[PDB]
């Protein structure tokens, strides 16, 4: 019976491959052979947010486009004022081996998590005036790669146990568990409508999950190694991934297939982070060659280079007004570009 | 400034002070992974050091050997996340010399050749050597197929083969030891290896080597 089911699975995979080959009427590059390139976009360091004592592993902007939570391996989680380079908060973490952070859309909460398999949610606005741990969320068998808030009482985690989780923060229990990955999940991004999300997971496969229903809505393939970064175009109907195979790729959910590959023959190091510009015209990608590049998303050419980091760029993020972009690298420095 | 910026600025400065006050401590802290390929040996060895000291996910253990802050990390596939440990001073690799070791050798080879671990030294503990001595003395199948040193030896030729096998998968120094059944001293013998490691790092940083 196992052989019969394996044959059925192979037939279904062949059907999916044929279906995705059908809709590929023309490559995305061909429809873009008439768009004005954006040229060389030279962004300078308006602010250098220094203070982290070790490698910065994650970063997140506020919805006010001014506050910024950065998170480093020394066990600290610092909230900066991007405009004035002011440290608003310094939250000491209980586990230093932490590899993600998030900033609540309402601004009342931040999130973090890592090798302790716990997603810690911190309350920023308390009467007592200190940032205390609102909740430790437990249940993941592996390490935690990324966490994002849908709202103040629902969070989403991805973990290196082939599993994502939607948590009700008040109760503390997994409201939904998303399974289906084979390898360790590395990055997830939430749609603007906060009803869907996407996940990359070390098996060169990405998955679009429905938060409410809980089932794997769609899958995508094409990469060659670990998928280390993922994000949505700023409308929730496209998403770009970066991998250790030194190749960024732009996928679309409705087309359900690969659309572009951002790569260069001189790019041999992997991709640690990706984030889109507000209009979607710029995809800023962080790399392990110490640099961060800026691709004209619609033309797959390199619009710019955000050089300035002496170690590997681990995180980057474009604000909600698109004003700046922040890059954090393993040099313990965070930098605001505009 | 509107003075509500000024106070704001002052707040940031205070935070900076605290972070600076920790930088010096972070440098003073010495990190050692514990990679042992098993569960019983690691438990026994950590139990011995915990007896010496007292007199979840990652299990960080914090101790002091000679008034030096020490953190032993003690965390299938281990490729992307297993890169945050490039900041550690050493990797204490505990394997038993009385149970054969192709898997231990292969894991060692994967560990040592990683660019993550280029600036990280390795301390090869070969424990349960009393068990190895007994296994050699009492008639038992001795290591073969390359052991051109005589199987029924007392204690030395088998040990030399084991180590010369362990120093061969290298394309920072690789220390090694033959601690006894549990042990009598273990902290002062890892302290030496970490001190030599940091001395060589300092010598390289002074372009003096």
């Amino acid at each position, epitope marked *: 019976e196992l052989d019969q089911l394996r044959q059925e699975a192979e037939q279904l995979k062949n059907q999916i491959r044929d279906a995705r080959k059908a809709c590929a009427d023309a490559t995305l590059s061909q429809i873009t052979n008439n768009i004005d390139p954006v040229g060389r976009i030279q962004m300078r360091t308006r602010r250098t947010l220094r203070g982290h004592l070790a490698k910065i592993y994650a970063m997140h902007w506020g919805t006010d486009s001014r506050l910024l939570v950065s998170a480093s391996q020394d066990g600290k989680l610092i909230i900066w*004022d991007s405009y004035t380079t002011n440290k*608003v908060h310094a939250i000491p973490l209980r586990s230093s081996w932490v590899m993600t952070c998030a900033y609540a859309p309402s601004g009342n909460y931040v999130a973090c998590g890592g090798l302790d398999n716990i997603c810690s949610i911190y309350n920023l606005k308390t009467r007592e005036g200190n940032v205390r741990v609102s909740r430790e969320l437990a249940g993941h068998t592996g390490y935690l790669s990324c966490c994002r808030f849908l709202d103040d009482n629902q969070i989403v985690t991805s973990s290196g146990d082939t599993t994502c989780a939607l948590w009700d923060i008040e109760t503390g229990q997994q409201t939904t568990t998303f399974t289906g990955h084979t390898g360790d999940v590395m990055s997830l991004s939430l749609a603007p409508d906060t009803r869907l999300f996407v996940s990359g997971a070390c098996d060169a496969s990405a998955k679009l999950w429905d938060v409410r229903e809980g089932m794997c809505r769609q899958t995508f393939t094409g990469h060659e190694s670990d998928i280390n970064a993922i994000c949505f175009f700023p409308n929730g109907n496209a998403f770009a991934t970066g991998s250790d195979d030194a190749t960024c790729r732009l996928f679309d959910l409705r087309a359900d297939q690969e659309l572009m590959t951002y790569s260069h023959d001189n790019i041999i190091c992997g991709i640690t982070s990706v984030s889109f510009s507000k209009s979607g015209r710029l995809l800023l990608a962080g790399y392990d060659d110490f640099n961060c590049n800026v691709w004209d998303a619609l033309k797959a050419d390199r619009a710019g280079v955000l050089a300035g980091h002496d170690n590997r760029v681990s995180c980057l993020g474009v604000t909600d007004d698109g004003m700046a972009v922040a890059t954090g690298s393993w040099d313990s420095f965070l930098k605001i570009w505009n | 400034l509107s003075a509500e910026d000024k106070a*704001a600025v002052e707040r940031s400065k205070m935070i900076d002070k605290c972070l600076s006050r920790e930088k010096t401590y972070v440098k003073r802290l010495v990190k050692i992974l514990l990679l042992g390929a098993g569960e019983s040996g690691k438990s026994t060895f950590l139990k011995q050091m915990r007896i010496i000291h007292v007199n979840k996910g990652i299990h960080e253990y914090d101790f002091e050997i000679k008034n030096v802050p020490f953190k032993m990390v003690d965390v299938s596939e281990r490729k992307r996340w297993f890169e945050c440990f490039d900041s550690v001073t050493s990797i204490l690799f505990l394997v038993s010399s009385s149970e054969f070791l192709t898997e231990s050798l292969n894991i060692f080879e994967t560990i040592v050749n990683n660019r993550v671990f280029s600036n990280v030294s390795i301390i090869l503990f070969l424990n349960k050597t009393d068990l190895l001595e007994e296994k050699v003395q009492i008639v038992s199948i001795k290591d073969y197929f390359l052991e051109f040193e005589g199987d029924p030896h007392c204690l030395r030729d088998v040990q030399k083969f084991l180590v010369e096998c362990f120093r061969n998968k290298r394309r920072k120094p690789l220390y090694h030891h033959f601690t006894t059944s549990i042990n009598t001293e273990n902290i002062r013998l890892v302290f030496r290896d970490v001190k030599d490691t940091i001395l060589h790092d300092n010598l390289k940083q002074l372009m003096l080597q």
Partner: single-chain antibody
Amino acid sequence: VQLVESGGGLVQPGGSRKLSCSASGFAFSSFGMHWVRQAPEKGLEWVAYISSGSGTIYYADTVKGRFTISRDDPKNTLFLQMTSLRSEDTAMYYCVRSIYYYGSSPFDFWGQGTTLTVSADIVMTQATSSVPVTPGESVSISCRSSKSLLHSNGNTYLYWFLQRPGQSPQLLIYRMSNLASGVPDRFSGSGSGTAFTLTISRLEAEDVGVYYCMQHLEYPLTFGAGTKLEL
């Protein structure tokens, strides 16, 4: 949160006194602290400010140098040391909590304070000392300033506080627009440089009392006479 102030009482002409505030239920070391006075039948007035880290210290120009401010963070106890107390110092003093970071809510908590009896700076006019109102009807209150408070950083630093009869003031409006925590959403207000009208839609009971308006644009912080909504 709880700021319990102690030390008040009656003093002879001259003399000295040491008022203190015990802080319980919050991170007192992270909070800047203020001393704010109020004459027995008059408006509020600012006395002093100590900052987080015991650094910045500002004084009221009226009695500056004659008193000092201090804090003891491990004991969470604030101090004001008054010296050479004349009759003009007869007021009820209140210890106020204010934290300064982006988006903070300065002057968010006030103690009950203690009485203390003895036997250029920006000016605000509280245009009216009283406004007769009927409960259930909307009310609006006027303060006029003698300088623009819209600083170049985009803020505006005027504050509205409410003293209900027999109580200590509670922050209604911080920074000329915003609303504090624990106050109903029916309170609001708007203005431009040197003019503001506070708005209370659906005036309920317990909203009787005096409304005060302050400038944290620079030092000193100046207070108006406060409008007394009556019912």
